[PDB]
Amino acid sequence: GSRRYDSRTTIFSPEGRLYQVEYALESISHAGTAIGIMASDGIVLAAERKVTSTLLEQDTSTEKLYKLNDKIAVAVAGLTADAEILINTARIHAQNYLKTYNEDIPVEILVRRLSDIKQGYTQHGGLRPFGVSFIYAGYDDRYGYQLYTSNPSGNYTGWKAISVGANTSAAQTLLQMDYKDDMKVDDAIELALKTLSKTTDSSALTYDRLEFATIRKGANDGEVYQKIFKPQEIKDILVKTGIT
């Protein structure tokens, strides 16, 4: 019957590894680099677009950075199509929580549930896993500013600064070197861009090949604002830090 054509996506190797999860991570390592840096007064999300064409519409485009709710955002690394399936689920889960408790969802709870969905695809169903790694950047009144990452295995961990996608080994070393705990948002913006500028496979880092976002408490008195940077705003912040 059909047994003949089954890849058996949810099994162990003799060494105790999940074949499909490992190969999905190999896929993700070729995707555009995404960096998250957490500061005391905000969070930065920076991401490199995959080899841009000059005729690509840049201003009305969304590839790397997505909004989950007013307090939480994610940076994507891997298959965009797969990420959007998970993003819409995460958006719905956040609204279910708000409907039930009349309170915005805590960041970890949203991350755990989204990570549990990925886990399910590695243990049962016979389907391929989602070829996606997220960087979650958000705020709540319990833990404040938070950075997480999840990968196709469904495992998630918290970070002060983290990179996903291509050249993470090189990127993580540079972040580990220059990062410190009493850092400000404006400094973290500069670190994120400098790190991408050195780890990039491109000749030079330009505004049209980037996506950028911040989560500050820079709004008026005790409230969080999400800023998804416009093309011109990236052009200005790139000149201001002396990269171009």
Partner: protein
């Protein structure tokens, strides 16, 4: 036993010159017993306002439901929902429960941000849209409100004058209804500013 008149309450909406107004009473009761005098029946999602009369549990449930739906709308559309669109969303959602309906009398009010046109609309419990230039009424004193609005209303009222007309319509209607009153709130809505006023009314 009649879901629409256990808790009581009223909502009214009016248009003016480059503005709209929406007002409601504050009573929540259990038949004869008055229970709460802080129960507001008007909500808003962005710049679109929704008033809801009828069974209180459904008022609360529908507010939470349209907050849910308009939030997802905004994330996907990357813009705030407009009154004309929202009106259709309310109609769809109510008719989805055709044979097990929410016992409510909702009222939409707002100004379209693109065209600047004042907009109001009303519904029955299964989602029949009632569009109107002048005014929309809802609740246990709907008859009274229809009478007050028809006689007091005139077109193209200024925001300050419109406030007086809608407030007098609500107050005098509420005083002729046993299950409505116990306070009132009036929203005056201009293109890019919104004023909210609490009225002094008789507390019986």
């Amino acid at each position: 036993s009649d879901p629409s008149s256990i808790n009581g309450g009223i909502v009214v909406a009016m248009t003016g010159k480059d503005c709209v107004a929406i007002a409601c009473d504050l009573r929540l009761g259990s038949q004869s017993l008055g229970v709460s005098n802080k129960f507001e029946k008007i909500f808003h999602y962005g710049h679109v306002f929704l008033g809801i009369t009828g069974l209180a549990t459904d008022v609360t449930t529908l507010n939470e439901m349209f907050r849910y739906k308009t939030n997802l709308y905004k994330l996907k559309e990357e813009r705030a929902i407009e009154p004309e669109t929202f009106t259709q969303l309310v109609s769809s959602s109510l008719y989805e429960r055709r044979f097990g309906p929410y016992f409510v009398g909702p009222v939409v009010a707002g100004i379209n941000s693109k065209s600047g046109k004042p907009f109001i609309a009303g519904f029955d419990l299964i989602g029949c849209i009632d569009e109107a230039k002048d005014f929309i009424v809802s609740g246990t004193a709907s008859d009274q409100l229809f009478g007050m609005c028809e006689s007091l209303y005139e077109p193209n009222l200024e925001p300050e004058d419109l406030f007086e007309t809608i407030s007098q319509a609500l107050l005098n209607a509420a005083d002729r209804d046993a299950l409505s009153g116990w306070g009132a709130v009036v929203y005056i809505i201009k293109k890019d500013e919104v004023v909210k006023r609490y009225l002094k009314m008789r507390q019986d």
